[PDB]
């Protein structure tokens, strides 16, 4: 339980950091918490994945996903598509994510899910770093700017 808490906090930090570069949509902003996946949280899952997928490839997201989710059917489709897309990414980038199984999408929560999401978020962050590196202390910058 201690390890689960630590990882969840790490996840929260990474998401907060991402939000500083890419603002969170209003729906997701209210859901974001350090303990949001200690228990299964389907609602947070959908919005977090939505956010991360858009950051990664908005065009691909538009092609693969229907949004916003309006009914149970559309929700089921979102989960299935999520698994498919994640597999695709795993193969394409050789991320070696183990057991991208239906359970990640059915009861998103717990240690296994948090670890997965941490890896995924890490991946998204790495892709963004690459983009930024191509395009191109915080205290010193702040003082200099002032």
């Amino acid at each position: 339980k201690a390890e689960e808490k630590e990882q969840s906090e790490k996840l929260h930090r990474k998401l907060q950091g991402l939000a500083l570069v890419h603002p969170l949509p209003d729906e997701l902003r209210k859901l974001i918490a350090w303990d949001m996946f200690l228990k299964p949280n389907q609602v947070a899952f959908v919005h977090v994945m939505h956010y991360l997928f858009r950051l990664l490839d908005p065009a691909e997201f538009k092609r693969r996903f229907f949004w916003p989710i309006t009914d149970k059917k559309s929700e089921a489709n979102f989960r299935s598509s999520t698994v498919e897309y994640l597999k695709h990414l795993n193969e394409k980038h050789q991320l070696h994510w183990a057991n991208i199984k239906s359970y990640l999408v059915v009861m998103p929560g717990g240690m296994r899910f948090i670890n997965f999401l941490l890896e995924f978020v890490g991946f998204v962050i790495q892709e963004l770093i690459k983009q930024r590196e191509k395009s191109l202390s915080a205290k010193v910058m702040a003082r200099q700017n002032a």
Binding site: G17, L20, A142, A146
Partner: peptide, 13 residues
């Protein structure tokens, strides 16, 4: 820290 950068981004604005 992430908090430091948050403050920096405020300063930059």
């Amino acid at each position: 820290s992430v908090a430091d950068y948050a403050e920096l981004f405020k300063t930059l604005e």
